[PDB]
Design a protein around this ligand. Structure first.
Ligand SMILES: *[C@@H]1O[C@H](CO)[C@@H](O[C@@H]2O[C@H](CO)[C@@H](O[C@@H]3O[C@H](CO)[C@@H](O)[C@H](O)[C@H]3NC(C)=O)[C@H](O)[C@H]2NC(C)=O)[C@H](O)[C@H]1NC(C)=O
Ligand SMILES: *[C@@H]1O[C@H](CO)[C@@H](O[C@@H]2O[C@H](CO)[C@@H](O[C@@H]3O[C@H](CO)[C@@H](O)[C@H](O)[C@H]3NC(C)=O)[C@H](O)[C@H]2NC(C)=O)[C@H](O)[C@H]1NC(C)=O
Ligand SMILES: *[C@@H]1O[C@H](CO)[C@@H](O[C@@H]2O[C@H](CO)[C@@H](O)[C@H](O)[C@H]2NC(C)=O)[C@H](O)[C@H]1NC(C)=O
Ligand SMILES: *[C@@H]1O[C@H](CO)[C@@H](O[C@@H]2O[C@H](CO)[C@@H](O)[C@H](O)[C@H]2NC(C)=O)[C@H](O)[C@H]1NC(C)=O
Ligand SMILES: *[C@@H]1O[C@H](CO)[C@@H](O[C@@H]2O[C@H](CO)[C@@H](O)[C@H](O)[C@H]2NC(C)=O)[C@H](O)[C@H]1NC(C)=O
Ligand SMILES: *[C@@H]1O[C@H](CO)[C@@H](O[C@@H]2O[C@H](CO)[C@@H](O)[C@H](O)[C@H]2NC(C)=O)[C@H](O)[C@H]1NC(C)=O
Ligand code: BES
Ligand code: NAG
Ligand code: ZN
Length: 875
């Protein structure tokens, strides 16, 4: 209509990327929501630094429409003739053509552009939107924004690139029953009617568009004060006020820890946290207004698990890290996203480590990031940390294991190598140098290279400009050689083409008899190096500190198995987990015989630590998974591993006792017991479940999930399913809801799972934020593995229409096919993919799950007999 679409390419707006010569300085943004109508309007005025002759000005806009022909101002202050406005859909631009070109802003004078826009609050979790909740029987509303990475442009027209930093003064006209929040504190409130209020916020510091946030709400607040004297407050529904307490404690403690560690003041006068009742990601670091999904913020000590406690603490820590890395210093372009996410993923563990001293957090990095992503990054369809992105779908896709976990892992290695004290100072100098501007990876190296004089750029580039990682092959006890580690032995190790040729500069640490030594393994040492007396055993890569795997000689591996059987405590908890993790990965990759790997599990009846058990359970889950339908192998593996956990499972018992890590251990260990078919563990679950159904007995917090899952699995029926469904509706605590959803996915009943799948289309029952979680839970169920898979196929058009191909969670949902392991199942996947070839943000996940399923097929072919032999001979 006004500002209509045109297929005109002849101009610089055909470029995916914005021009270098147009730069915003300041945004004047006003929005007015019609909450009950699911609509809003706004005007935005943008001051523009023009650097080159141009007849056109363009910026990002999606879905939201322009309603008034835009208005441009010369730097002197005069009004500029405008011929046309038009939308260019292909690159999400709205363009305006001036009558006849104009002139760079040479002085302190700037162009001013004003646009009138109207958008929707319904049918979406990005941009500016409204959702509801219930309070004392009344349906209440809350409106908020979510922009990362390319959704600012849905909320309001803007220069929607992270490096187009500008300053912000936002105002909102809302009904008076409501408050309004944004990045900055309130400046002034003025009555429009006796019904409407206009809330104006004070001028922001320069910040990227994706960080710009506002909300209209009727939430209560829980308050805290930083050591700086700034108010740190969490907004929360009155009924849920008590559950905001913990997040308040951790925000205070971690805010205070960080401001000191980074040697830099938090840039805003206040900081707010709020959980939107329906929220599309886990949390979002909007400067001064961090938004949450309830499960990641709201915690009840009387009802929530230790798992939940640690999650809340970590996400809060995480989002707080961004207030420095991401907010103050932002990446120049999304290819450098890890500068944000890896740093947050790394420092989160230090944040919470300060707050909660006996959580062994620094160790837990191995379980949360390091070892999981070493699985991910051993695929051909991984990608380097520095990622080429050319579409919004490509950009959103890279919020993934690589940016977060490998980012986190290579910082962990870097810190240990360069040493913490110097890593600290180097991050500090990087922070003061690039404050309120944008950095590239190159800059962070140079920053740390000024801090250690060590070769940081030379060494870290190898870890960063190519995908994958090495396995160190041990020859003798002491000679090591490096080689790319790929899970698929048939894959071509030189692909895709890398300038660095898939060799790394590896910082290598090893323990000789309780004494530790260091070496940097140069890329150019083509025929390996020797590790610098009188030695019988050499412990390489202690605590799995380096982002690599170590393949000892078979003789050594054998000797490690025996040493574990005799006195496992000889190795640290981490070293055990790491040795077990490498061996099973090496076996998977056909680099070590499975008999050798399995032999390392023999000691387990005496295993008592969290870390080794976690990585054991991870490795076994996969093997068990591949033989699910093998009536010959399965009972044997079940029987074995049942026997290996039984003592620890019995020792810990079905009761909440012990410190944090013990409580976590009991969870995974009792769950594995149940998974492995321990009659007595299953009976504990059923018994507790039956009691829970009696309506009063509040289950031990760290056992609930297991009780709902295995209780429903073993004794669930329509009566208890219906009851569980009601309970899920009735409870206010999102953390409990999510457990109950997992419970409901556990029923061994096709009819009930079918009803459950149908509920996904009902927004009164399942929130939009939870659809993918539920699909994923159902896929874990022995019937539902195929039910969820079939349902996403039948309902693909429906999902795409509801979420759009740009939604990452929709892109990722095909990973429910990870357990598939037959040529039949692979053919199904490929057929579905060929029928719906427009994959959007699902393009990478598709590649990844396909590789995995192919690997599974090969794996079964290579290893069935060997694994069978090992189990048969033992039992
Ligand atoms: C929850 O799980 C518990 C196991 O972790 C169950 O408790 C166990 O029940 C077993 C059978 O009743 C007992 O087995 C006995 O073990 C001893 C060895 O210590 C043997 O001498 C006995 O032969 C053997 N049973 C018999 C009938 O002779 C376990 O000792 C017992 N206790 C422990 C601490 O493991 C719970 O029963 C289970 N709860 C529910 C409700 O099912
Ligand atoms: C590393 O794994 C090796 C390979 O599995 C182990 O060696 C195996 O030890 C088994 C004893 O548990 C033997 O199983 C026996 O096999 C014969 C058939 O050849 C049967 O008659 C026996 O009944 C059976 N034993 C039992 C208890 O049922 C295997 O002979 C033997 N395999 C090989 C290839 O030598 C190693 O022990 C192990 N190393 C460790 C633990 O350090
Ligand atoms: C929010 O609701 C509006 C109004 O119901 C949706 O717009 C409608 O879209 C359908 C087709 O998709 C048309 O049949 C209606 O005539 C439209 N009505 C109006 C007033 O535009 C809108 O699509 C919804 N927004 C989202 C994101 O789903
Ligand atoms: C938040 O911090 C407070 C203390 O700063 C925690 O401690 C509570 O308060 C008193 C005295 O300060 C303690 O003796 C109690 O053990 C605590 N609980 C209660 C119910 O009073 C409080 O636990 C922290 N909040 C959490 C963990 O959610
Ligand atoms: C459990 O819950 C369901 C859903 O509320 C009950 O309702 C029946 O559900 C089917 C569709 O799944 C409808 O076609 C029937 O009309 C429903 N019955 C009604 C409305 O009375 C189901 O009956 C419940 N079962 C038990 C044992 O409580
Ligand atoms: C799965 O759940 C359905 C739903 O309850 C079960 O079907 C019911 O069976 C009972 C007893 O045979 C009847 O009283 C109900 O009328 C049935 N309900 C419906 C909706 O058909 C079914 O038996 C269960 N199946 C399994 C394998 O457990
Ligand atoms: C503890 C974190 C890993 C939780 C995580 N949140 C984040 O990473 C935020 O900092 C992200 N900036 C939010 C985000 C996630 C995905 C796509 C776009 C934007 C999330 O899961 O949302
Ligand atoms: C930085 O923090 C220090 C100590 O907390 C404070 O004295 C100073 O005013 C801050 N600098 C500012 C606000 O520019
Ligand atoms: Zn983050």
């Amino acid at each position: 209509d006004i500002c209509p679409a045109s297929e005109d390419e002849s101009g610089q707006w055909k470029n995916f990327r914005l021009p270098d010569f147009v730069n915003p300085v300041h945004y004047d943004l006003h929005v007015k929501p019609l909450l009950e109508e699911d609509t809003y309007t706004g005007t935005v005025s943008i001051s523009i630094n023009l650097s080159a002759p141009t007849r056109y000005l363009w910026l990002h806009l999606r879905e939201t429409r322009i309603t008034r022909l835009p208005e441009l101002k010369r730097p002197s202050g005069d009004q500029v003739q405008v011929r046309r406005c038009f939308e260019y859909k292909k690159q999400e631009y709205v363009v305006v053509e001036a009558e006849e070109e104009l002139t760079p802003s040479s002085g302190d004078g700037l162009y001013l552009l004003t646009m009138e826009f109207a958008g929707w609050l319904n049918g979406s979790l990005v941009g500016f939107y409204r959702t509801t909740y219930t309070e004392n029987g009344r349906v209440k509303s809350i409106a908020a924004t979510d922009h990362e990475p390319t959704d600012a442009r849905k909320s309001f027209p803007c220069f929607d690139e992270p490096n187009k930093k500008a300053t912000y003064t936002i105002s909102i006209t809302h009904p008076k029953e409501y408050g309004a929040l944004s990045n900055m504190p309130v400046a002034k409130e003025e009555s429009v009617d006796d019904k409407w209020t206009r809330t104006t916020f004070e001028k922001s510091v320069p910040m990227s568009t994706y960080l710009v946030c506002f909300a209209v709400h009727q939430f209560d607040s829980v308050k805290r004060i930083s050591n700086s004297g700034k108010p740190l407050t969490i907004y929360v529904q009155p009924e849920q006020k008590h559950t905001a307490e913990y997040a308040a404690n951790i925000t205070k403690s971690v805010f205070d820890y960080f401001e000191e560690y980074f040697a830099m003041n938090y840039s805003l006068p206040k900081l707010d946290k709020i959980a939107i009742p329906d929220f599309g990601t886990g949390a979002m670091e909007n400067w001064g207004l961090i938004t949450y999904r309830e499960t990641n913020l709201l915690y009840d000590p009387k009802e929530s698990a230790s798992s939940n406690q640690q999650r809340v603490a970590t996400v809060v820590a995480h989002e707080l890290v961004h207030q420095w890395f991401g907010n103050i210093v932002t990446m120049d372009w999304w290819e450098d996203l890890w500068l944000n996410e890896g740093f947050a993923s790394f420092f989160e563990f230090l944040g919470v480590n300060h707050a909660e001293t006996d959580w062994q957090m620094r160790d837990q990095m191995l379980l949360e990031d390091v070892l999981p992503v070493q699985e991910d990054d051993s695929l051909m369809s991984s990608h380097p940390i520095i990622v080429t992105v050319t579409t919004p779908d490509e950009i959103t896709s890279v919020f993934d294991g690589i940016s977060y976990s490998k980012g986190s892992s290579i910082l962990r290695m870097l810190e240990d190598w360069i040493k913490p004290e110097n890593f600290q100072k180097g991050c500090q100098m990087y922070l003061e140098k690039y404050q309120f501007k944008n950095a590239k990876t190159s800059d962070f190296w140079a920053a740390l290279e000024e801090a250690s004089r060590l070769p940081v750029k030379e060494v870290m580039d190898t870890w960063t400009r190519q995908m994958g990682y090495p396995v160190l092959n041990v020859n003798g006890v002491k000679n090591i050689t490096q080689k790319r580690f790929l899970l698929d032995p048939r894959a071509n190790p030189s692909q895709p083409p890398s300038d660095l040729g898939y060799t790394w500069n590896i910082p290598v640490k090893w323990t000789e008899d309780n004494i530790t030594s260091s070496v940097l393994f140069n890329r150019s040492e083509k025929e390996g190096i020797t590790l610098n007396s009188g030695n019988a055993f050499l412990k390489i890569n202690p605590d799995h500190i380096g982002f690599y795997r170590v393949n000892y000689e078979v003789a050594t591996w054998d000797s490690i198995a025996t040493a574990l059987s005799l006195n496992h405590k000889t190795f640290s908890s981490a070293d055990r987990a790491s040795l077990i993790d490498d061996a099973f990965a090496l076996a998977r990759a056909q680099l070590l015989d499975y008999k050798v790997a399995l032999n390392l599990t023999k000691y387990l009846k005496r295993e008592e630590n969290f870390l080794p058990w976690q990585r054991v359970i991870s490795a076994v889950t996969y093997i068990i998974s591949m033989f699910e339908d093998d009536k010959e192998l399965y009972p044997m593996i079940e029987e074995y591993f049942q026997g290996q956990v039984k003592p620890i499972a019995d020792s810990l018992g079905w009761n909440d006792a012990g410190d944090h890590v013990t409580k976590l251990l009991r969870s995974s260990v009792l769950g594995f017991a149940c998974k492995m078919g321990d009659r007595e563990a299953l009976n504990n679950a059923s018994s507790l479940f039956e009691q829970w159904l009696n309506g009063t007995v509040s289950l031990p917090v760290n056992l609930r999930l297991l009780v709902y899952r295995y209780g429903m699995q073993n004794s669930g029926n329509e009566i208890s399913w219906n009851y569980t469904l009601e309970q899920y509706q009735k409870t206010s605590l999102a953390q409990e809801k999510e457990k109950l959803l997992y419970g409901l996915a556990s029923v061994k009943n096709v009819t009930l799972l079918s009803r459950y799948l149908d509920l996904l289309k009902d927004t009164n029952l399942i929130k939009t934020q939870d659809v993918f979680t539920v699909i994923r839970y159902i896929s874990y169920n022995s019937y539902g593995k195929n039910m969820a898979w079939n349902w996403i196929q039948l309902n693909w058009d429906y999902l795409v229409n509801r979420y759009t191909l740009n939604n990452r969670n929709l892109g990722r949902i095909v990973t429910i096919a990870e357990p598939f392991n037959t040529e039949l199942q692979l053919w199904q996947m490929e057929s579905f993919f060929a029928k719906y070839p427009q994959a959007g943000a699902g393009e990478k996940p598709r590649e990844q799950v396909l590789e995995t399923v192919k690997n599974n097929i090969e794996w079964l072919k290579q290893h069935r007999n060997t694994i069978r032999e090992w189990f048969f001979n033992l039992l």
